[PDB]
Structure 1
Amino acid sequence: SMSYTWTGALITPCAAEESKLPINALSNSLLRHHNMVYATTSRSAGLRQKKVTFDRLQVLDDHYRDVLKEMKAKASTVKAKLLSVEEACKLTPPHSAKSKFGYGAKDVRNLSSKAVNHIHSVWKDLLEDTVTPIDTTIMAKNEVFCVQPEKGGRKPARLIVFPDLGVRVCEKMALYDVVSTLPQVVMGSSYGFQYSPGQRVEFLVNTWKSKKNPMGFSYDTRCFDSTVTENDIRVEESIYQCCDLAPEARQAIKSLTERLYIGGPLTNSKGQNCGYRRCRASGVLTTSCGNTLTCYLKASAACRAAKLQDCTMLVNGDDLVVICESAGTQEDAASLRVFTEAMTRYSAPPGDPPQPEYDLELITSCSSNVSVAHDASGKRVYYLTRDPTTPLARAAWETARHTPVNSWLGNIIMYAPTLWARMILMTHFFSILLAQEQLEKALDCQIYGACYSIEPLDLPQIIERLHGLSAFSLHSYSPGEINRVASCLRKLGVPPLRVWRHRARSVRARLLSQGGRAATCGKYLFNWAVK
């Protein structure tokens, strides 16, 4: 069936949408080619609709059926509980879209009688009505990227589909305990979300070294959410039901699947009907768990169809990495094509055909890759890095415009061990915090699904806990990583690394001069700039 059927009404914004990077001195201090940085807007919604709309054909086989039976068997060992209205309220993110019914996320979090009474009513309706399609809003996302001249130039806006806040809180009551425990049990070490950056690296490196002659590849599905079929969604529901659940939870899960997860009507910010969805909604509670389980099921089956040897998989939504025993150059190439044809039959064709890789550093998944450097004693240390283009573009954007979110702070924490986060992001932002004497002001930072209130002076402790002390002394990075960073700087018109090392020496001196916590940051975060 068609992933979407549209009416013609447009996907409308609900606030101003900025698309250009504003010429700023501070921002130009970091990046000079401002014209290359842009943000998506509802203006390009049409192009996206075109890409995400297509008929899905799916043919399953015994490889698929076998893996699904194996997953259900593991699922049957899971026990999950219903969250109460109050627990679900307390776990609701602070900045989510307010309800059309007169209350917002803050009212939910504060257990307002208005929010609470309405949520009890939505819950009772879910249990008593298991058929009426539930309303969802469709919006264009506003995200920042760097232009890609080697093609479409600017990317069209991504689309987000979500139900009302009341329903979202009810999804948590029914499924929060399930989505936070089931994936790990079913998939084991292949469940990517259980790992911090260093643990992810550890799993990949140990897996890689365990093969006599390792071969690996990344796979990513073109418009994965659109490739998810009704049968895939019902299969997910059948997996949830294998768990030992409370009766109301079972009833609510079934109702949510029928009325919301399998599909339903799309409404724009104007209240007009935009169309109908027959695929994965990107803004529901089960989006991540569902996508990961489905990608894992199809990829596991595909590995069997392609007869890949001693496969080990790592899955984060539609992002897949498979490491296996090489069967030879031409044999591997042919096996990957068979793998891809199986994934295609199961409905998940790739954006770009996967390619066999014999160098772990060259495999990119979740927009990241493993790389190596050396610690103080000269020992090899593996860590997670990524191309710095998007992180840099977003940093310049946040430098030029106060943003409710500090993605740059999130990158500093997740990528603390990398050459670019240390030399460029840390130097750039601490220089700014010093100049504005806001070194002690807490900033909101979205990381791993949660919004934290982080005081910059806490960074050394945060990084130490997440990456370990060696994060402050890595040196001798790989040529491939150094060249990628250098090229990216040239492309974006950001000062070469020589300049950053010089600027970092100054920031460090300024931090030490203050003593206390500030000096601690100078000592640890910028020990690399010394001598």
Structure 2
Amino acid sequence: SMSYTWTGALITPCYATTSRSASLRQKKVTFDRLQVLDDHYRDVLKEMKAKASTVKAKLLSVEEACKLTPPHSARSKFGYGAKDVRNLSSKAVNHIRSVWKDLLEDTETPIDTTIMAKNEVFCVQPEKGGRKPARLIVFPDLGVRVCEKMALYDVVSTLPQAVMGSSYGFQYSPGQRVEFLVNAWKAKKCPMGFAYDTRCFDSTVTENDIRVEESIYQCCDLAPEARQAIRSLTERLYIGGPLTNSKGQNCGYRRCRASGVLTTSCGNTLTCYLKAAAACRAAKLQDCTMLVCGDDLVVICESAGTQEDEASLRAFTEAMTRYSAPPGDPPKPEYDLELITSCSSNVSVAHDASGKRVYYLTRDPTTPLARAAWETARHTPVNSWLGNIIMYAPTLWARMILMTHFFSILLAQEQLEKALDCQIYGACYSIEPLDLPQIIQRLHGLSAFSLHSYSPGEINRVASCLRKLGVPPLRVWRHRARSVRARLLSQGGRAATCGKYLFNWAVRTKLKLTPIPAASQLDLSSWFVAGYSGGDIYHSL
């Protein structure tokens, strides 16, 4: 079947990516899928199902599901918004209960979805190509989204880890991800690793893939209504349905993965894992270790030789193609762990204050800096700079540029204590910047404040990026951080801790740094459990 069918009605509005480029994306994501399954696929599936069998999932109440709704989640077309949902307003609640009742009674009628072009900031690079088309987002109404949580929130939070174990990427903090990859690399006699990039993964997801995914969810111990709701949501929403633009016009139909449903991340991880594990067997890759985050796949295995490794990747690719997961860029074997870019990141190493080696995750800073520049220029709902400070806290660029720039703005605006929204693995977190030292200590360890001896390649990538973007050099940032640090120190409490810990790299004579006592009190239990991209998930912490 066709991933999409279109009426010709435009994807209407609600460098930055806009609805103008939607037509270019539509051409790429629109194709017929030809999927051929074999015994390797069937074997891996049965193994996954046996692990899913151990899961017991709870049905969330309306109230618990309402509490997970982001405050700025798109309003319902039925006369209520995200604020009404969170406040448990009679109208919102009554509508949610009728949506739920309808899921239990109607097992066939397709549910309507809205299609929108996503507005994302990318860097204006005229040397290696041109502007990227806007990504497309497909999501059901707010009432349906609350119902999805009731039936599947506990499933999507618990099941992926039970099924995939250590291969489930979203259970890891950046430090644990680094440790997993380093351990996997070290465990091989002669390691070889590769990233597998699927061309438009969401469009490659077939109706059968979605039913196979349900077959895995159905192995859980579930309440009868949860079981019916999962069955109904699969047929009416997950497998496909009609697409409506922002103007309420019929845009066409979808027969592939919707990017804005609760099961997107979980389903994509399960599907990518299933296909990859089966393709590993077809390719005869030896002693495979996989790390899967949605459509992002990394494989670490035993090298069989240079030519043999090239042949085994072509074989893996041919198998993924048969399973309807063809490649964007063909995979390349790597013989150094640092050379693998997975989840847009690479492993790097630094030294702590005692000279001990510390592995950390980094990435090219172009996109994070350009997005930070967009956010500094215009008020945004999500602060990517805050997410990048949290996730890339040990990096040279996040410490010297992002922390220095944003802490000077927060000092000037006197908004250090004001909670900000940021995204962590697709979920929305409301965070006070004053809590950053505690968060960083918990996710990366005390050493994240004392790291030095950065690699020449990492130093050069940062410095070249600053030049290209017209950002002042690192020496200017050191000078700026000293003033930012001094002002934070003068304020006391958490503000002084931000100065002392985040800006210890800036001082002539570096301070001792003892663990932050209150850091253990932060409840980070919901943090690196699961991925919720497009899942409409929220938490205050």
Q: Distance in 2 between matches of 1:517 and 1:465?
A: 16
Decide whether the 8 Å contact of 1:215 with 1:323 is kept in 2.
Answer: yes
Q: Distance in 2 between matches of 1:329 and 1:455?
A: 50
Decide whether the 8 Å contact of 1:40 with 1:157 is kept in 2.
Answer: yes
Compute the displacement of 1:406 (Å): 1.5
Compute the displacement of 1:233 (Å): 0.7
Compute the displacement of 1:513 (Å): 3.7
CA deviation digits over 1:86-141, x for unaligned, max 9?
22112222221111111111111111111111111111111111111110000111
In structure 2, the residue matched to 1:47 is 24
CA deviation digits over 1:245-289, x for unaligned, max 9?
222111111111111110010000111100100100000010000
In structure 2, the residue matched to 1:3 is 3
Q: Distance in 2 between matches of 1:392 and 1:468?
A: 24
Is the deviation greater in 128-137 or in 145-154?
145-154
Is the deviation greater in 468-477 or in 405-414?
405-414
Compute the displacement of 1:176 (Å): 1.1
Decide whether the 8 Å contact of 2:170 with 2:425 is kept in 1.
Answer: no
Q: Secondary structure at the match of 1:528?
A: coil
Q: Secondary structure at the match of 1:146?
A: coil
Q: Distance in 1 between matches of 2:416 and 2:250?
A: 48
Q: Secondary structure at the match of 2:505?
A: helix
Q: Secondary structure at the match of 2:8?
A: coil
Match of 1:314 among 268, 278, 291: 291
CA deviation digits over 1:382-437, x for unaligned, max 9?
11111111110011111111222211111111111000000111111112222333
Decide whether the 8 Å contact of 1:93 with 1:450 is kept in 2.
Answer: no
Compute the displacement of 1:78 (Å): 1.4
Q: Distance in 1 between matches of 2:159 and 2:298?
A: 21
Provide the aligned length of Structure 1 versus Structure 2: 507
Q: Secondary structure at the match of 2:138?
A: strand
CA deviation digits over 1:31-88, x for unaligned, max 9?
xxxxxxx101111110110110011111111111110111111111212121122221
CA RMSD of aligned residues (A): 1.3
Change (3 A) 1:271 1:513: same
Q: Distance in 1 between matches of 2:295 and 2:425?
A: 17
Compute the displacement of 1:153 (Å): 1.4
Q: Secondary structure at the match of 1:266?
A: strand
Q: Secondary structure at the match of 1:313?
A: strand
CA deviation digits over 1:181-232, x for unaligned, max 9?
1111110000001011101111111111111111101112110000000110
Q: Secondary structure at the match of 1:152?
A: coil
Match of 2:211 among 220, 223, 234: 234
Is the deviation greater in 367-376 or in 87-96?
87-96
Q: Distance in 2 between matches of 1:258 and 1:446?
A: 30
Q: Distance in 2 between matches of 1:365 and 1:342?
A: 21
Decide whether the 8 Å contact of 1:2 with 1:53 is kept in 2.
Answer: yes
CA deviation digits over 1:308-345, x for unaligned, max 9?
11000000000001101111111111111111111111
Q: Distance in 2 between matches of 1:444 and 1:124?
A: 33
Change (3 A) 1:128 1:513: closer
Identity across matched positions, percent: 97
Change (3 A) 1:436 1:178: closer
Q: Distance in 1 between matches of 2:207 and 2:315?
A: 25
Q: Distance in 2 between matches of 1:173 and 1:522?
A: 43
Change (3 A) 1:91 1:443: closer
Q: Is there any run of 5+ residues in structure 2 with no aligned partner, and where?
A: 508-541
Change (3 A) 1:83 1:512: closer
In structure 2, the residue matched to 1:442 is 419
Q: Is there any run of 5+ residues in structure 1 with no aligned partner, and where?
A: 15-37
Change (3 A) 1:115 1:428: same
Change (3 A) 1:439 1:74: closer
In structure 2, the residue matched to 1:19 is none
Compute the displacement of 1:515 (Å): 4.0
Change (3 A) 1:252 1:452: closer
Is the deviation greater in 500-509 or in 274-283?
500-509
Decide whether the 8 Å contact of 1:63 with 1:304 is kept in 2.
Answer: yes
Match of 2:369 among 392, 398, 420: 392
Compute the displacement of 1:492 (Å): 1.5
In structure 2, the residue matched to 1:262 is 239
Match runs of 1:221-370 below 5 Å: 221-370=198-347
Structure 1: 4+ residue segments shifted above 6 A: none
Decide whether the 8 Å contact of 1:313 with 1:322 is kept in 2.
Answer: yes
Match runs of 1:379-458 below 5 Å: 379-458=356-435
Change (3 A) 1:504 1:316: same
Change (3 A) 1:75 1:518: closer
Decide whether the 8 Å contact of 1:89 with 1:169 is kept in 2.
Answer: yes
Query: Is 1:498 the equivalent of 2:475?
Result: yes
Compute the displacement of 1:448 (Å): 3.7
Q: Secondary structure at the match of 1:513?
A: helix
Match of 2:466 among 480, 489, 513: 489
Q: Secondary structure at the match of 2:299?
A: strand
Compute the displacement of 1:479 (Å): 1.8
Compute the displacement of 1:520 (Å): 2.3
Q: Secondary structure at the match of 1:107?
A: helix
TM-score computed with the length of structure 2 as normaliser: 0.91
Decide whether the 8 Å contact of 1:139 with 1:161 is kept in 2.
Answer: yes
Q: Secondary structure at the match of 1:288?
A: helix
TM-score computed with the length of structure 1 as normaliser: 0.93
Compute the displacement of 1:151 (Å): 4.3
Q: Distance in 2 between matches of 1:242 and 1:336?
A: 33
Q: Distance in 1 between matches of 2:10 and 2:434?
A: 46
Q: Distance in 1 between matches of 2:87 and 2:318?
A: 51
Change (3 A) 1:309 1:89: same
Decide whether the 8 Å contact of 2:80 with 2:91 is kept in 1.
Answer: yes
Q: Distance in 2 between matches of 1:76 and 1:424?
A: 48
Compute the displacement of 1:150 (Å): 4.1
CA deviation digits over 1:448-486, x for unaligned, max 9?
444333332222112112211100000011122112212
Q: Distance in 1 between matches of 2:145 and 2:300?
A: 37
Change (3 A) 1:119 1:144: same
Is the deviation greater in 90-99 or in 428-437?
428-437
Decide whether the 8 Å contact of 1:215 with 1:356 is kept in 2.
Answer: yes
Compute the displacement of 1:518 (Å): 2.9
In structure 2, the residue matched to 1:76 is 53
Match runs of 1:36-115 below 5 Å: 38-115=15-92
Change (3 A) 1:177 1:403: same
Match of 2:129 among 140, 152, 155: 152
CA deviation digits over 1:356-397, x for unaligned, max 9?
111111111111111110001101001111111111001111
Is the deviation greater in 189-198 or in 430-439?
430-439
